[PDB]
């Protein structure tokens, strides 16, 4: 079980694709919901994503049918197509997934944020960093549901620097485009969702607190956060969950005026990556860093909840620390940071001590020694 949000609101979920092309925005929306009596949300909703994960693992595509057999019925505790809870303007998080992931696999984070009163737009990147994604070649294909699938690109070592950088720039552009789409929907522009789902997008009119926008992401998504902030000042702060810094150009490090929070796992990080994080620091800039004790890179994604303790620990999906404990720390510390730097009038300042890593399962800053 992926855990329910800890906040006071029920949580809804839906998909939005606009436009229908491979240059369009594709996202999964998690939002405060009126009702709590809808079907839960199917976690990995098409077989092709499992074929995708199989290539990301470097196994035969038959492993995909086995992954699907194991995980293809699993849901996540968000009310599918529930109407939006009205009568309140919600701040917005745009969320970026890791390499080999896709939009649906950080529901534990997305659901928790929504339950505290955020709308979360988990984008699906079309840069070939996703295990899989899809779109429609033209209008005809969109009307009849004829999907075109795009799979993870495997790189030669000679391509790594250049292509990873092309990808993080495209990721940043997709985050800005998703923000613009949501903002245009907030300002009432009618938008025909390329997916025929029974979530009326007109509900989102005048529901976004338009100043209060943040970007959050895991791994490749943590680089995406940083690139996005340097390019798009509409985002007022960023939170990088166990960021993979390699994709970033040397030019970006001095170019992030917004507050930035690094939440790292204990076992993922290494000097080269910490050094790059520390190139983001300047005395004028607001920077914070914490490390979750006993955590691994996968503690931020939903597969940390999808298997039992023994097999999870074997596959590096779980760490020494409990998965619910770990994600509660990351989510609560994120909430306090967002409250601080978006100027929210909620109670998330109860978790301020977590930003300084003041907790027995936290390390202030980093465990990684440099030079
Ligand atoms: O984005 C990056 N990059 C690296 C790989 C390359 C070296 C650096 C680390 C990594 O593991 N991730 C996070 C991937 O996260 C997930 C989560 C769920 C999932 F189904 C698939 C993937």
Swiss-Prot record:
Its EC number is 3.1.1.47. It is linked to Platelet-activating factor acetylhydrolase deficiency: An enzymatic deficiency that results in exacerbated bodily response to inflammatory agents. It can be associated with several disease states including inflammatory gastrointestinal disorders, asthma and atopy. Asthmatic individuals with PAFAD may manifest aggravated respiratory symptoms. Glycans are attached at residue 369. It is found in: Secreted, Extracellular space. One of its GO terms (cellular component) is extracellular region. Changing residue 315 to A: Impairs the association with HDL particles. The active site is at residues 219, 242, 297. GO terms for molecular function: 1-alkyl-2-acetylglycerophosphocholine esterase activity; calcium-independent phospholipase A2 activity; hydrolase activity, acting on ester bonds; phospholipid binding. Lipoprotein-associated calcium-independent phospholipase A2 involved in phospholipid catabolism during inflammatory and oxidative stress response. At the lipid-aqueous interface, hydrolyzes the ester bond of fatty acyl group attached at sn-2 position of phospholipids (phospholipase A2 activity). Specifically targets phospholipids with a short-chain fatty acyl group at sn-2 position. Can hydrolyze phospholipids with long fatty acyl chains, only if they carry oxidized functional groups. Changing residue 242 to A: Loss of activity. Induction: Up-regulated upon monocyte differentiation toward macrophage lineage. The gene is PLA2G7. The chain holds residues 55 to 425 of 441 of the full protein. Changing residue 219 to A: Loss of activity. Plasma. Secreted by macrophages (at protein level). The lineage of its organism: Eukaryota, Metazoa, Chordata, Craniata, Vertebrata. Keywords: Asthma, Disease variant, Glycoprotein, HDL, Hydrolase, LDL, Lipid degradation, Lipid metabolism, Phospholipid degradation, Phospholipid metabolism, Secreted, Signal. It catalyses: a 1-O-alkyl-2-acetyl-sn-glycero-3-phosphocholine + H2O = a 1-O-alkyl-sn-glycero-3-phosphocholine + acetate + H(+); 1-O-decyl-2-acetyl-sn-glycero-3-phosphocholine + H2O = 1-O-decyl-sn-glycero-3-phosphocholine + acetate + H(+); 1-O-dodecyl-2-acetyl-sn-glycero-3-phosphocholine + H2O = 1-O-dodecyl-sn-glycero-3-phosphocholine + acetate + H(+); 1-O-tetradecyl-2-acetyl-sn-glycero-3-phosphocholine + H2O = 1-O-tetradecyl-sn-glycero-3-phosphocholine + acetate + H(+). Changing residue 144 to T: Retains the ability to associate with HDL particles. This is Platelet-activating factor acetylhydrolase.
């Amino acid at each position: 079980k992926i855990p329910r949000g800890n906040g006071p609101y029920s949580v809804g979920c839906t998909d939005l694709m606009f436009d229908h092309t491979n240059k369009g925005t594709f996202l999964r929306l998690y939002y405060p919901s009126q009702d709590n009596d809808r079907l839960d949300t199917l976690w990995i909703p098409n077989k092709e994503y499992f074929w995708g994960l199989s290539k990301f693992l470097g196994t035969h595509w038959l492993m995909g049918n086995i992954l699907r057999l194991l995980f293809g019925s699993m849901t996540t505790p968000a009310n599918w197509n529930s109407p939006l809870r009205p009568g309140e303007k919600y701040p917005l998080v745009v969320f970026s997934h890791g390499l080999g992931a896709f939009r649906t696999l950080y529901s534990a984070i997305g659901i928790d944020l929504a339950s505290h009163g955020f709308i979360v737009a988990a984008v699906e990147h079309r840069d070939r960093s996703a295990s899989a994604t899809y779109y429609f070649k033209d209008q005809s294909a969109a009307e009849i549901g004829d999907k075109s699938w795009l799979y993870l690109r495997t790189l030669k070592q000679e391509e790594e620097t250049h292509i990873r950088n092309e990808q993080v720039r495209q990721r940043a552009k997709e985050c800005s485009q998703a923000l613009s789409l949501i903002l245009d929907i907030d300002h009432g522009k009618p938008v025909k969702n390329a997916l025929d789902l029974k979530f009326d997008m007109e509900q989102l009119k005048d529901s976004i607190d338009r100043e209060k926008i943040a970007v959050i992401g895991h791994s490749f998504g943590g680089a995406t956060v940083i690139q996005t902030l340097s390019e798009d000042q509409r985002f007022r702060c960023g939170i990088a969950l166990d960021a993979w810094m390699f994709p970033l150009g040397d030019e970006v490090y001095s170019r992030i005026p917004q507050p930035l929070f690094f939440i790292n796992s204990e076992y993922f990080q290494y000097p080269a990556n910490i050094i790059k994080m520390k190139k983001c620091y300047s005395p004028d800039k607001e920077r914070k860093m914490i490390t979750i004790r006993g955590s691994v890179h996968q503690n931020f994604a939903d597969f940390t909840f999808a298997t039992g303790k023994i097999i999870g620990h074997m596959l590096k999906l779980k760490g020494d620390i409990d998965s619910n404990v770990a994600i509660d720390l990351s989510n609560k510390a994120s909430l306090a940071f967002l409250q601080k730097h978006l100027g929210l009038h909620k109670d998330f300042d109860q978790w301020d001590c977590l930003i300084e890593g003041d907790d027995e399962n936290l390390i202030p800053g980093t465990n990684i020694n440099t030079t």
